[PDB]
Amino acid sequence: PREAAAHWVPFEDKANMPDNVPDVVEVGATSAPLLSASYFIGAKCKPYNDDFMLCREESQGSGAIDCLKEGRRVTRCAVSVIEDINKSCLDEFRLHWQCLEQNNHQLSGCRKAEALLNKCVFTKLNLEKKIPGLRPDEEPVFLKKDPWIKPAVDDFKSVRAYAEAKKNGTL
Amino acid sequence: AIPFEALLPYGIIFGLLTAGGGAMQVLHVYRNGGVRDRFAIDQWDSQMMERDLRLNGGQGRKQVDQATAPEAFKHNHVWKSERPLI
Amino acid sequence: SSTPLVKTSVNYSYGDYPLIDADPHFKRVVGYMRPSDYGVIGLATAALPAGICFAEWLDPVKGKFARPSVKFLRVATMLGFAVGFGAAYARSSLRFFGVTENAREYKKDEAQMAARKAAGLEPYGTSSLTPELQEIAAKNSAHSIAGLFIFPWFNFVNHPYHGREQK
Amino acid sequence: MLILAIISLITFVSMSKLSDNRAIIRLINIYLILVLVLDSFLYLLFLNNQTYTVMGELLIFNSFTFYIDMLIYFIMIVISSLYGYNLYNNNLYKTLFEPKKELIILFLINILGALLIVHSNDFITLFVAIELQSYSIYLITAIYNSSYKASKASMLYFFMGGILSILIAYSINTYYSVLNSYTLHSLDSLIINTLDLNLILIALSLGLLFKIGIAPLHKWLISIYENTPILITIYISLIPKISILSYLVLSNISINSLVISILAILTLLVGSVGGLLQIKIKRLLAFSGLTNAGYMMLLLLLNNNEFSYLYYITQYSISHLAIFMIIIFSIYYINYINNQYNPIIYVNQLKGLIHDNAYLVLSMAIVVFSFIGIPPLLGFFGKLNILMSILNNGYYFISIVLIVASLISALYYLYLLNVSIQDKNNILINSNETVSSVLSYILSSLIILITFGFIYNSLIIDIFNVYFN
Amino acid sequence: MNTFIIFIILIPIVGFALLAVNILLAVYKPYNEFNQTRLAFNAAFILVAILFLPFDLEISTLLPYVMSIYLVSNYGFTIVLLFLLILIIGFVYEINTNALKINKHNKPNTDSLIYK
Amino acid sequence: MIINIVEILIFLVCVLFSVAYLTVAERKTLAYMQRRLGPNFVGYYGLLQAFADAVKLLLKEIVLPKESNYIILVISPLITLITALIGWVVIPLGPGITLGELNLGILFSLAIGSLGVFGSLLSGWSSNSKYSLLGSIRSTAQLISYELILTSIFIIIIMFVSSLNITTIIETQRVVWYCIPLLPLLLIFFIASVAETARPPFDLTESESELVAGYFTEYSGSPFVFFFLAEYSNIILISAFNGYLLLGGYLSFNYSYLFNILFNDYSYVSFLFEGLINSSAYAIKLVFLMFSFIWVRAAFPRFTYDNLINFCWIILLPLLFGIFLIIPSTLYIFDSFPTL
Amino acid sequence: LWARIYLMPLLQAEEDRQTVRRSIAQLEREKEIMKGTGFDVDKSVYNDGKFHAPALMIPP
Amino acid sequence: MYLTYYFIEITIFLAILCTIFIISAKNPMVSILYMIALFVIAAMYLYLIGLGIFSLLYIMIYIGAIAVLFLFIITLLDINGNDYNTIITQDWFNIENTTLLTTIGNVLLTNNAFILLVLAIVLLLGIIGPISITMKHK
Amino acid sequence: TAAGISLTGGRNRCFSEWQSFMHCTAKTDAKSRAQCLPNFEDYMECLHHTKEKARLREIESVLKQK
Amino acid sequence: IRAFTINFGPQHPAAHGVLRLILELSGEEIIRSDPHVGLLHRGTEKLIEYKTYMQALPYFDRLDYVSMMTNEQVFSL
Amino acid sequence: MFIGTIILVLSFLGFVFNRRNIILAFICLETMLLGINLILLRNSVLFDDISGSLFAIVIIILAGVESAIGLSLLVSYYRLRGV
Amino acid sequence: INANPGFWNGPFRYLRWSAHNRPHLFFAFAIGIAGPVAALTLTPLRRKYLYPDHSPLPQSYPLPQRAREGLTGFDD
Amino acid sequence: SSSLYRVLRNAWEVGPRSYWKQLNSIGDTKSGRLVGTDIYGNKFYETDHQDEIHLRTRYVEYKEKDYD
Amino acid sequence: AIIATAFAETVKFSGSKQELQKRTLALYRQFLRGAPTFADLYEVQFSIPTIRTKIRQEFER
């Protein structure tokens, strides 16, 4: 919760998870894939993560030491989601963060690559991006048409993929 | 038409800033290795990119997509030793 | 946008009379003041020019009994309205504290609260704020009629909690 | 309603000529009167010392501070009433005591600064307000610019004000360096047991106190209080006293202070003996101003002293205020006037005041009796109730050095009367002009308060018992 | 190692390479080659910089506001607008007192030819 | 370590090598503005002459007045020069391409311009003649007085941004520029822009007629190239500020429609061409602006100092507070509050 | 914003387990320095024994 | 990279060096010339401690106004064992870079807005005072 | 006020230790504050880590000894 | 007691002229001035008494050297 | 904690022993207002808040207005003299 | 000459008069007065006529108030 | 005038070797017709072209590098 | 040109030899008083009593 030093030195410890906690399948996803699939792991693993922050709340002082069962719980289901999308829409999902690896991860960059993915995951993995807190008669901003902030350079692959989504009638 | 001799040093400066911007594109992409720059360092993003260097192995922003972790991922993770601040 | 989520004293009186509110909203203070209160405003507005005419009748500036300029009278009228309004707000919002005579307004706030319960909206109305800002702005306006001698401060907030029974 | 006055009136002064300077101050006089009269009832805002914390743990409004909050308006009515009214309609009293353009602005800025100390819970509001009133007194000293002693005294006041600025700030910094608050709920008789917050709160106290004339830092305020003009000193020897002393008595941050007690002894001693061999009246008067703050240091030591403080405040801010106005009247009858900014200096100059009138003398005599505790006066019961608080908690040697201080004080207070009733050889028989009526009527009021103030001795005790507890 | 810290350090050395190049390249360095009483002023010289400090200072006072302006929705607006509306009348003190008027005593002698 | 030391050299020959031909370009302009030919004897089309200026100027001597502390006459040229040269970090050159990106851009951008007064005040104190001192006074008082409004519009710019990073502003500015909604802001900024530079619509203080042959110090040598180059660096530095926070910084149009026609994939050619066109939009705005400074330098006479202070505090700055009352209000009418 | 906060517990659980590993590892190492000489290693510096991060490490 | 460790202990000593030249100077202006360097060493210490914000705040206001103000006046004369590396974790609770400056703008405006409101009167006094003194109206 | 605020406006290092102290005070009158002392001491260890520094210099002395 | 009085131009203050010109400035306000002229003073009148009117004519286009022809004209007249 | 203490204390010792140069008193006071910062700012840093920074921005401002007011006091001190 | 009629003799005439003689004051002052007055009166209208506000942005992880139910899945 | 078209067309008329000499000699591009030469040896010209200002018509091409 | 320069006087012709003598005596006092100013102002090589012994002998002429 604090920025680093004048001259901080990094350090690590070659030790292990000692006795009781079994090993987990720890998320080996870099920022751009998990940022892309953030809505879907928030959609499927909603009450699990909600339980996580609830249990971290009620464990005042215990905190970190209490909910190890739950840190085991909430990561694994997200790993299940990303493995299912590794099997599901790996071309288009990868393409979404092939676009999103530029633009400083600004989500404003890759609308045309995004809407191709929204049909795909809702087809096979049958999940959906939903923005909570958005009261009705208010357009969700990745659903709207003619945005004000149009991005800098759309990638060359997903624009052709978008045209082919129109020609195949998948859109 | 126009006095070209007046615009000729302006043509120079218009070329000089252009060549500067071309080289300052090329060097930054060559540092990044294929992607553009990052025009906004967030604290969220700073911790995130530390995690990403920690994940990919060696390289800066290789940005890999993997199901699970490597075995060194449980061991590569570091803390920061801030000095005594006297 | 209506949960207080802070621990507020409930019906904690300030005198011998029952309260209504810990900070009455500024539109409400206009909406409940007695007709004898407006006389305090008017007599305060008359007091300042009569005060300057008095003060020169007592001891003139340059030895001659002369009435001052109309400029001084207009500005004294402005500050007389300032004193009268400060007195009006001050005399009015005590009755929400239950510290002076609370007879008609406790009846009227058994009416208008009940008038908007049946009307189905919020008992005080929605402010344009996140509730944490509603808390902090009401912490600013809490008891701020005290220290009216230093500075005027008011309640423009319309936050939820008011020292009511439950809501 | 201070800010509601200020924001209008500085627009008003900027849109005004130079001859309106009396009339603006007449306006502000009547204004503050009507602020007091029409809004007095806010003492009803409590019944059992019910204390409000306003603007979110920042200000503190209570049973206590409302009194000082009224008191400062009451004295400012008098100070303003000096300016706005002529003394006489003479050539002399218009090249003397003519206010500047910006002066009455700086007063309400200072009153904002004084009130935001006494009402302050936070140290940050404290620091802002002491900077505010320090800048106020910087200007109000330096505003009568074409006097060499005035500017020299402004610089002199400036650098000690800067030291106490940084010293109070260093105390707040150190208190923050050991604790993550700035308020004063964090004391609550539990951290005092288990943490050495003695020296830090002591260093807070000393930095707040040394803007008074506390006797290590002794000569410099006295040099100011003579190098100022005779008018400004009657304001600036009062407001920095009663502002911060009401703060320090409101929060008893140093209880059984070894430091403050020794400094109180040394304060009383050197003030009483410093009043002795002096013929300059502004000096003598400032050393009276010292020793009375000497008594204030005693009232800082105690626990739960809201009677003797407030009663001695309303004693002092009447008597000390009024004796100036008496010698402001007295300069008409004298035979030698120098120094347009500062007409009387030498106490010799009012040699024959009784053969001018008996009644300004009698009015001077009772107020100088009021500084020495003469029992039928209001000035007495201050010292009486101080001592009813002193031996309440066993400051025995403090009480006997109070007696030594009172006697050595009362030696030099009578020196005024030694001068004042003697032979003059050149007596007045007929003055043309009279003194401007309601200006002198204020002094008549302020002196019947002191004489006949033991009348309401009972009722003020009842108001004390009901309201302040 | 970052070029940001290299930038502010290299430029004084570039300035030294432009500084000592004259001492290297010049020659004939220095050959053989009343102010009794007065200095003159108006308040218009001395006052501009002294009055400049609160008006410079208020920008840095207003500067933490503009970063956080989304958080203080509809209320920090009200506070800062009260702050400004104090400072603006503080400004229009001086313009009615004409504090930066540096007026000339070249008056055309208003008073007429009153004679005999 | 290797690719950054070339990253700073290419920027140096992009800027320091350009600011000389700026001083050639001003002569070419004022030639055709006053119907005569520019420098033509010196180079091929009369280019390069700033080299012949400097190399001669590096060969003249270091004659020093006896009243001047010589160290002070070393410090003020050097620090004015390096002030106007370390103002060159977070100029943006395309998206996020600065010398060092840091999230507080404007604060550095503005504090170094705040340091810009500090050399010129210090400079006139050396050679302590009474005219030489009071000229430094008259210069520094306007040099702070419009440094106010220069500073003071930077906050109302970021009342649309609410972020101190400079390159964030342009990506905010993609939907619309800031000059085209806020037009009179540009006019008062343009006069405030030529104020903080020594420009003679406003620089009366370089009056050789008033002083005993004094412009600032007449201190010449390789000292003389220092304040001179600092002045012309200040010119296009404040042009750069005008470029990003008021005008289209590196933006021209959408140009994605063009790209998907041209390329099929990302490649170093694509980065090359996009960085070219972003730098060229920045260049064309910057190069019209440096011309506009001369275009107002020609057509107008100088001021009275009374005019100059009247021009600051009475006619410009209450209008600036009117901006401070209308733009939070326009922000308040709609929801419209910007987030980081 | 919603995208970041969905990811918040996912990273939180991992940094949790990094803390749980490295803390107890440091505690065991300080046990292994203070083996032999009797002294409390596993006693926490608090008065209410709760898990927390350690600070103030010995300079390497 | 062990030269990196003593950075802070550089600028402390360079501070101690500088202040001696404050209180030992022939001319008045030589002293403030050392003092502006003390401000710069201070700002580098603030950048090195980890507040890059206030480093540049001070350059805007200290060697921005008040130093240059001192220069401007002084022109106008007639004739001359805590060695423990603290451990820093990483938590993911923050969502947006509300930096130090944002939260100043929140606490000055919500929690303690009255301080800024009275600060308006302090800045008012800064206007009135020099016009209260240095003018001599009529 | 700026009571439990942080750099990023969240909660500081010892907010919990502060709030557990304030929970210690809100349920407790004077002449019974003595039981509040270990809640207070847990706060103080946050600020200056005096018990922690005393813990670490001893084990550092043992590590130096061998 | 007097102002810090200046020399306005030795060489190139006002173009086309050597304007040595004493100024006494009290607020950057001229209380009085005193221009010393004589810096171009060739003494031409002493010369023109020694030459014939025939020869004496180009003394005068030297005089007022921006409007030669009116000087020529006025002497011819 | 060393640097703010040492700047403050050396500024204090410079204020005491150097009266007769009067501007030196101002600038030692100004460095005192810097030294209180250099202690307080790192207390904000070490204590994970901006509450000390809240007091710090205010004392920056008050140091400023101090330099604004007292230097006009200086100009009043020298107008009535000559030197 | 355009000396003064006075604000307190005829207002609207004096407003016209200042607009003819000192627009530096009055057209800063008009932009200044148009700020808060429009800020007071227009904001009820926009919620009534144009469009209502936005949903508030969350500032942390939003915590609901529930009782930690039995949640199965991913034991091993 | 002095437009780009004129300098381009006269350079295209004269010839690039004489142009490369002339640009090192004068700054202009000038295309005359050899009215005559000098006994010292100096080739003169005269310009027909319509877009010429007054008294830009006739000019010298010298012989010596150290002309005057 | 209403006003004179600093030391310039209106020329006025003394009617008597004695009044002329009084003016000349005051004048030599003025030279003799301003003589150390001259060596500063005109930066001369030599000493002040040489200036004084010239100013004496010029009136001796």
- Which DSSP state fits D61? B
Chain G nearest C-alpha distance from B26 (Å): 31
Given a contact cutoff of 8 angstroms between Cβ atoms, the answer to whether F150 and F184 are in contact is: no
- Which DSSP state fits H111? I
Chain A nearest C-alpha distance from I19 (Å): 11
- Minimum Cα–Cα distance from B52: chain A residue: A30
Q: What angle do CA J26, J32, J38 make, to 5 degrees?
A: 130
Q: Does E54 touch chain D (CB under 8 A)?
A: no
> Residue E4's beta-bridge partner residues?
none
Any residues with CB less than 8 A from the CB of E78 and at least 6 apart, and which? C156
Q: What is the total residue count of chain F?
A: 340
User: What is chain C's Cα-based Rg?
Assistant: 20
- Minimum Cα–Cα distance from I65: chain G residue: G33
Please name the residue that has the structure tokens 């989601």.
Answer: A81
> Residue A11's beta-bridge partner residues?
B79
Note the Cα D448 to chain centre separation in Å.
20
- Which DSSP state fits A63? G
| Contacts with H122 from chain K: Cβ below 8 Å | 61-62, 65
- Minimum Cα–Cα distance from G39: chain I residue: I59
Note the Cα C99 to chain centre separation in Å.
14
Q: What angle do CA E57, E61, E62 make, to 5 degrees?
A: 120
> Residue J33's beta-bridge partner residues?
J23
- Give, in order, the Cα–Cα distances in Å from K48 to each of B81, D303, I9, M6, M27: 17, 36, 10, 72, 69
Q: Of M28, M23, M17, whose CA–CA distance to M53 is shortest?
A: M28
The domain of C139 spans: 1-167
Given a contact cutoff of 8 angstroms between Cβ atoms, the answer to whether F19 and F286 are in contact is: no
Given a contact cutoff of 8 angstroms between Cβ atoms, the answer to whether H54 and B44 are in contact is: no
Q: Of D136, D198, D138, whose CA–CA distance to D171 is shortest?
A: D198
| Contacts with M1 from chain B: Cβ below 8 Å | 1
Q: Can you tell me the distance from the alpha carbon of L67 to that of A41, in angstroms, rounded to the nearest whole number?
A: 23
Given a contact cutoff of 8 angstroms between Cβ atoms, the answer to whether D39 and C90 are in contact is: yes
When CB atoms are compared, the residue of A1, A3, A7 closest to H5 is: A7
Given a contact cutoff of 8 angstroms between Cβ atoms, the answer to whether C148 and C86 are in contact is: yes
Q: Of G10, G17, L75, G4, whose CA–CA distance to A52 is shortest?
A: G10
Note the Cα F45 to chain centre separation in Å.
27
Q: Can you tell me the distance from the alpha carbon of D382 to that of D370, in angstroms, rounded to the nearest whole number?
A: 10
Query: SS3 of K12, please?
Result: helix
H helices of D15-64, where? 21-38
Instruction: Name the fold adopted by E3-28+32-97.
Output: Methane Monooxygenase Hydroxylase; Chain G, domain 1 (1.20.58)
The domain of I26 spans: 1-66
Q: Of H121, H108, H133, C137, whose CA–CA distance to D115 is shortest?
A: H121
Q: Which of residues 27-46 of L touch E (CB under 8 A)?
A: 32, 35-36
| Contacts with I23 from chain A: Cβ below 8 Å | none
Q: Can you tell me the distance from the alpha carbon of F78 to that of F73, in angstroms, rounded to the nearest whole number?
A: 9
Two tokens at D244? 């911060």
Please name the residue that has the structure tokens 């911790």.
Answer: B47
Does the CA dihedral A67-A68-A72-A75 come out positive or negative?
Answer: positive
- Largest interatomic CA distance in chain M: 36
- Give, in order, the Cα–Cα distances in Å from J38 to each of B73, F213, J21, J41: 94, 20, 11, 5
Q: Can you tell me the distance from the alpha carbon of B74 to that of B69, in angstroms, rounded to the nearest whole number?
A: 8
Phi/psi at J18 (5° precision): -100, 95
Q: Taking the CB of residue I35, how many other CB atoms lie within 10 A of it?
A: 9
Q: Can you tell me the distance from the alpha carbon of D124 to that of I3, in angstroms, rounded to the nearest whole number?
A: 13
CB contact under 8 A, K75 and E57: no
The domain of L39 spans: 1-76
Q: Can you tell me the distance from the alpha carbon of D171 to that of K59, in angstroms, rounded to the nearest whole number?
A: 14
CB contact under 8 A, H7 and A8: no
In chain L, the number of structural domains is 1
Q: Domain spans of chain A?
A: 1-171
| Contacts with E107 from chain J: Cβ below 8 Å | none
Q: Can you tell me the distance from the alpha carbon of G15 to that of G28, in angstroms, rounded to the nearest whole number?
A: 20
Any residues with CB less than 8 A from the CB of J9 and at least 6 apart, and which? F209, J18, J19, J20, J21
Chain H nearest C-alpha distance from E81 (Å): 10
- Give, in order, the Cα–Cα distances in Å from D308 to each of A63, D229, D369, D452, F210: 54, 32, 19, 19, 70
Q: Can you tell me the distance from the alpha carbon of H108 to that of H114, in angstroms, rounded to the nearest whole number?
A: 8
Given a contact cutoff of 8 angstroms between Cβ atoms, the answer to whether M27 and F46 are in contact is: yes
Q: Domain spans of chain E?
A: 3-28+32-97
CB contact under 8 A, H114 and C140: yes
- Residue type at position D202: I
Given a contact cutoff of 8 angstroms between Cβ atoms, the answer to whether K69 and D138 are in contact is: yes
Q: Can you tell me the distance from the alpha carbon of J9 to that of D49, in angstroms, rounded to the nearest whole number?
A: 80
DSSP-assigned letters across all residues of I13-60:
TTSHHHHHHHHHHHT--TTSGGGGHHHHHHHHHHHH-HHHHHHHHHHH
- Residue type at position D116: L
Q: Can you tell me the distance from the alpha carbon of M46 to that of M60, in angstroms, rounded to the nearest whole number?
A: 9
CB contact under 8 A, L32 and F322: yes
E strands of J2-64, at which residues?
A: 6-7, 21-25, 30-35
Q: Is J65 exposed, middle or buried (0-12, 13-18, 19+ CB in 10 A)?
A: exposed
Q: Which of residues 55-74 of E touch K (CB under 8 A)?
A: 57, 60-61, 64
Any residues with CB less than 8 A from the CB of H38 and at least 6 apart, and which? H15, H18, H19, H22, K7, K31, K34
Q: Can you tell me the distance from the alpha carbon of E70 to that of A135, in angstroms, rounded to the nearest whole number?
A: 20
In chain I, the number of structural domains is 1
Using CB atoms, list chains with 3+ pairs below 8 Å to chain L. A, C, E, F, G, H
Q: Domain spans of chain H?
A: 4-138
Two tokens at A49? 């993560």
Does the CA dihedral D250-D253-D256-D260 come out positive or negative?
Answer: negative
Q: Can you tell me the distance from the alpha carbon of N60 to that of F186, in angstroms, rounded to the nearest whole number?
A: 77
Chain H nearest C-alpha distance from K51 (Å): 8
Any residues with CB less than 8 A from the CB of N25 and at least 6 apart, and which? none
Please name the residue that has the structure tokens 């008594």.
Answer: D295
Given a contact cutoff of 8 angstroms between Cβ atoms, the answer to whether L71 and A73 are in contact is: yes
Any residues with CB less than 8 A from the CB of D369 and at least 6 apart, and which? D377, D379
In chain D, the number of structural domains is 1
- Give, in order, the Cα–Cα distances in Å from J23 to each of D420, F205, N8: 61, 18, 16
Q: Of C147, C164, C157, whose CA–CA distance to C98 is shortest?
A: C164
Two tokens at D272? 């009483």
In chain C, the number of structural domains is 1
Q: Can you tell me the distance from the alpha carbon of D147 to that of E8, in angstroms, rounded to the nearest whole number?
A: 51
Q: Taking the CB of residue M32, how many other CB atoms lie within 10 A of it?
A: 18
Q: Does K1 touch chain B (CB under 8 A)?
A: yes
| Contacts with E94 from chain F: Cβ below 8 Å | 313
Strand order in the sheet with J21-25: J6-7, J21-25, J30-35
Q: Does I51 touch chain H (CB under 8 A)?
A: no
